[PDB]
Curated annotation (Swiss-Prot), chain A:
This is Major capsid protein. Signal peptide: none annotated. Belongs to the herpesviridae major capsid protein family. Homomultimer. Makes the hexons and eleven out of twelve pentons. Interacts with triplex proteins 1/TRX1 and 2/TRX2; adjacent capsomers are linked together in groups of three by triplexes, heterotrimeric complexes composed of one molecule of TRX1 and two molecules of TRX2. Interacts with scaffold protein; this interaction allows efficient MCP transport to the host nucleus. Interacts with capsid vertex component 2/CVC2. Interacts with the small capsomere-interacting protein/SCP. The chain holds residues 51 to 99 of 1376 of the full protein. It comes from the Viruses. It is found in: Virion; Host nucleus. Transmembrane segments: none annotated. Self-assembles to form an icosahedral capsid with a T=16 symmetry, about 200 nm in diameter, and consisting of 150 hexons and 12 pentons (total of 162 capsomers). Hexons form the edges and faces of the capsid and are each composed of six MCP molecules. In contrast, one penton is found at each of the 12 vertices. Eleven of the pentons are MCP pentamers, while the last vertex is occupied by the portal complex.
Length: 49, 44
């Protein structure tokens, strides 16, 4: 009898940055994220009449 | 004397053979079995 082949899957990884999903996001590499407690962004909106 | 000759056919010159890989094996009467062992890894 005989072996005719050993056929094996290869998992091609998909980076998040090279999906087109990442156009819906802004990506910043942040080194020490365990150190941060809270993030905060402040808006100031003037409204003329 | 009037005779006919039937049209002869070739296997590899038919469009059926897109659905088969074709390796000629010289002594198939000397075979018991054959096997293909797939190994499917799986991501999570």
């Amino acid at each position: 009898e005989a072996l005719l082949g050993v056929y094996t899957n290869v998992v091609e990884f998909v980076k998040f940055l090279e999906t087109a999903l990442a156009a819906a996001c802004v990506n910043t590499e942040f080194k020490d994220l365990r150190r941060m407690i809270d993030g905060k962004i402040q808006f100031k909106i003037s409204m003329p009449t």
